[PDB]
Structure 1
């Protein structure tokens, strides 16, 4: 804080709409902060960084976990973000239902009303996954797909099955 104050005392600072710090990502793997912009999102990592325009997004999927304790937030990309010799077709995020948050936008009330048409507010609070879903919806306009009318025998909304030498969850959307 002292260094920041010393910097501000000499600089003339004039941005991101909202910044989520450290969100459990599964594809790619690791903790990544997410900065929101009017036309894209900056996925900042401890080493690698990516920038996904909203024009590249195709679908947003919000799925529950088999144990009913976690939430999967999937973003379908196009073109896929590239990293050396690998291309990711989906951005997967993992959240916990008991992981709340309180966010405040970097905009004013009237500007938010004009931009998001009242879909968002200057200050919000609620579950982390709910907040991310609401923000991404208000940004992309695409509706977030949710599980259908399927309910497995174990009461879960998916089936545990293998695929390409790897276990995982299959959701009938």
Structure 2
């Protein structure tokens, strides 16, 4: 369970990052073509192109900020598979770092991708670096505001309570499990003190229900989802 020796050749490292999914502390060592996640029990290597999507959202707890990475293939921890990695930072923790890149290399190969020197909130530095190396856009909260200006509403999926973010183009739920449902997949939304939101998928794939959403949220949630020409009911 020694995590390992200093990652001296990494472009940049983020030590002791709290991952909520999978749950553990990982060092994130970022290289030219890959990222290594090093923990005391498990470790992984990802190719940049393996990151399919990057989502950056404030946590509903007013304290943390989350970065969510959709990965293909998913990551395996024993018999459990993880198509999303969820990283958590305190919203105001900061990283000041000079990238480990020689001047010539930086100029020829990274100048439009990365900064030489970062000094910002850690989640911002990491998302900037990942956007630069993976070429994926970073998805952020959109136009949806609850009643009480929040990015997400509390609910349950199966036996597990969590938070549902109506993003500009998708439903995003975390954490057990983590779910991303693009609106393009949504046949209709069967709606039904609290209420339930059944996301009926196109082509009879089934439904994903986000249950026990406060009734204090239903009309706004309805108006937004309407604004996306989905269905409702």
Aligned to 1:154: 148
Deviation at 1:57, TM superposition (A): 1.3
Return 5+ residue gaps in structure 2 as ranges.
1-7, 168-233
- Which has more radius of gyration? 2
Given that residues 20 and 87 in structure 2 are in contact (C-alpha distance below 8 angstroms), is that contact kept between their aligned partners in structure 1? yes
Once structures 1 and 2 are overlaid, which stretch shifts more, 46-55 or 71-80? 46-55
Deviation at 1:84, TM superposition (A): 1.6
Matches of 1:110 and 1:161 in 2, distance apart? 51
Once structures 1 and 2 are overlaid, which stretch shifts more, 105-114 or 21-30? 105-114
Matches of 1:118 and 1:77 in 2, distance apart? 24
Corresponding residue to 1:74 among 68, 71, 74: 68
Corresponding residue to 1:109 among 91, 103, 108: 103
Aligned to 1:131: 125
Structure 2 vs 1, CA of residues 117 and 104 (structure 1 numbering), >3 Å: closer, same or farther? Answer: closer
TM-score, normalised by the number of residues in structure 1: 0.87
Corresponding residue to 1:37 among 15, 24, 31: 31
Task: Provide, for residues 79-126 of structure 1, a one-character-per-residue CA deviation record: whole Å limited to 9, x for no partner.
Answer: 111122111110100111220111121112332232223342322111
1:1-173 counterparts in 2 under 5 A?
A: 15-173=9-167
TM-score, normalised by the number of residues in structure 2: 0.65
Matches of 2:132 and 2:76 in 1, distance apart? 26
Matches of 1:98 and 1:57 in 2, distance apart? 25
Matches of 1:63 and 1:155 in 2, distance apart? 14
Given that residues 113 and 133 in structure 2 are in contact (C-alpha distance below 8 angstroms), is that contact kept between their aligned partners in structure 1? no
Matches of 2:117 and 2:111 in 1, distance apart? 15
Return 5+ residue gaps in structure 1 as ranges.
1-13
Given that residues 67 and 156 in structure 1 are in contact (C-alpha distance below 8 angstroms), is that contact kept between their aligned partners in structure 2? no
> Paired residues, what number?
160
Once structures 1 and 2 are overlaid, which stretch shifts more, 145-154 or 105-114? 105-114
Task: Provide, for residues 113-159 of structure 1, a one-character-per-residue CA deviation record: whole Å limited to 9, x for no partner.
Answer: 32223342322111000011100000111110111100011211111
Deviation at 1:69, TM superposition (A): 2.5
